[PDB]
């Protein structure tokens, strides 16, 4: 990036704790010495060999991000072969964080939740970004309740990825036209987060995606298959048609048929009047 | 390993290299001479810390293929960081070598070698290989008449990718099926091979595949437009209705109407009475 600051980000912020990691880097939680705001400081080591198209690309994918929904940015620092990238720190952790000492979400936390992720999702796509790895550990809360969609790693990865086909993809005069089509543009479309919204709505409610608890390579392989059946909501009793039905269409199988973001925040389950943060905060008084 | 039935020897001991042949997708070929048989070969050498995963899968593909229309496979020798694959010599060299010299390729001939690459194919697609680089370059002649196809170094490189991205594709059970499809199966299939051979078709008729000078980058993108139109052969009055339609049907750009290649083998062009090994013996006589 062209604007990253060539100084010690310890010289702006001071280290708290460890976070753990996302889909690659370390995350520390830190705060602003100037006003005391709390901040994510995301580190990546560097090494003098090192292709730079990942980060790049994570990097302008935060900056050219300006909605509400989305984890903000403030910056990134060079500074000793390591790269920090600046972002919103979420008081609550994220969801996963949260059910795994509170429980099961109500359906119309839930519905808060998706909403807010639905207006982030909208956003993307508008933006021509796809987030591809939307799950509860990527939908943050912070201390008023609010929902920010964090890890653009996934999605820096890909577009990397797309980046190095065209760089290598050779001598096109034989070539298909689908054969193009995935070199360029690759093998799906954005319309994936709105399956992941559908699996991560059920993660919600059982603490758990759909099978779980199988082979991860076996499940890959049988969602392959013509006779793959979406999943559902295991407690039909529990849920209101409403959701049931945002299941079914955000877990429609194929994609041409799947409705995209801005489609699901006309739904009903989503829609509804009384969404608001107050859903969520009655949710962290459960943590506390 | 590489290879379990690999020779741990300098091929020199074998072999009196004879000639530089050029470079396939990756490696440089010999023309060479077995000592005691005194047979002509041609040896592929390939500089080999390096992942042996393309190799591995391009020497698999050669040992396991048992087809009249595949370049035959004698083995593999590995000597000071070289590998070296052998395989069989054509004694005419790729249909390139011989259009340059010889123009453009009767009807009939074009017919024949159509046939022959599609026997080929459906013998690949059926013990589930994609070709993925069927050209002239890559269709050769031996001195019985013989039509064999060449050069898997694509197809094992494609290979190595889907091996290397299934081991790294992660947790997948928020992934949109489309999604695992794509890391699995990748987004295209063996029907890419067909609208090849159509390609290929009109290079041995035109001599250069349609749009040769149009820039690379053009033509790619220029695929992934809604109204895209295949190409065409450029001389109607030339060829016959039956060539006509074999470029028109494997040059379909849905890669869900395109035929097969065991489809294909019923078609007008190639089904027609007689092609026989009695016009290639008589366009070799030509090149002499
Ligand atoms: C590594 C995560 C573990 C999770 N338990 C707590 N995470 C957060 N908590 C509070 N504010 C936060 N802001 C941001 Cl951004 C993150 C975050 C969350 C997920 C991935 C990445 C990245 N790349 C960063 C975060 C950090
Ligand atoms: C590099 C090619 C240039 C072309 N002019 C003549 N080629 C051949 N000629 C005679 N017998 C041959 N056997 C085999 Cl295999 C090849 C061959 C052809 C094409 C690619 C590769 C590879 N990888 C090997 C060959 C060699």
Same mark, same amino acid.
């Given at each position: ?151 653009? =790693? $996934?999605? %820096?990865?890909?577009? +990397? #990825? *797309?980046?190095?086909? @065209? ?30 919204? =559908? $699996?991560? %709505?059920?993660?919600? +409610? #059982? *603490?758990?995606?759909? @099978? ?77």
């Amino acid at each position: 990036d062209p604007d990253i600051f060539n100084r010690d980000p310890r010289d702006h912020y001071d280290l708290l704790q460890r976070l753990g990691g996302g889909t690659y880097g370390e995350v520390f939680k830190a705060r602003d010495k100037v006003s005391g705001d709390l901040v994510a400081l995301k580190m990546v080591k560097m090494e003098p060999d090192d292709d730079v198209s990942t980060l790049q690309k994570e990097i302008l994918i935060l900056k050219t991000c300006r909605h509400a929904n989305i984890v903000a940015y403030h910056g990134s620092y060079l500074w000793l072969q390591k790269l920090w990238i600046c972002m919103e720190f979420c008081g609550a952790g994220s969801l996963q964080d949260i059910y795994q000492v509170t429980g099961s979400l109500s359906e119309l936390q839930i519905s808060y939740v998706c909403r807010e992720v639905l207006q982030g999702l909208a956003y993307l796509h508008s933006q021509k970004k796809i987030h591809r790895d939307i799950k509860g550990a990527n939908i943050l809360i912070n201390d008023a309740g609010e929902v920010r969609l964090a890890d653009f =790693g $996934i999605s %820096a990865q890909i577009g +990397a #990825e *797309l980046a190095r086909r @065209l760089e290598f993809i050779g001598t096109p005069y034989w070539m298909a036209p689908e054969v193009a089509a995935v070199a360029l543009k690759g093998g799906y479309n954005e319309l994936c987060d709105i399956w992941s919204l =559908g $699996i991560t %709505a059920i993660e919600l +409610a #059982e *603490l758990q995606p759909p @099978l779980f608890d199988v082979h991860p390579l076996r499940v890959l392989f049988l969602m392959t298959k013509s006779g793959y059946q979406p999943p559902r909501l295991k407690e039909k009793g529990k849920w209101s048609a409403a959701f049931h039905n945002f299941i079914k269409v955000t877990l429609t199988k194929s994609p041409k048929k799947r409705p995209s973001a801005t489609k699901m925040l006309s739904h009903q389950l989503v829609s509804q009047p009384g969404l608001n943060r107050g859903l969520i905060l009655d949710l962290l008084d459960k943590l506390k």
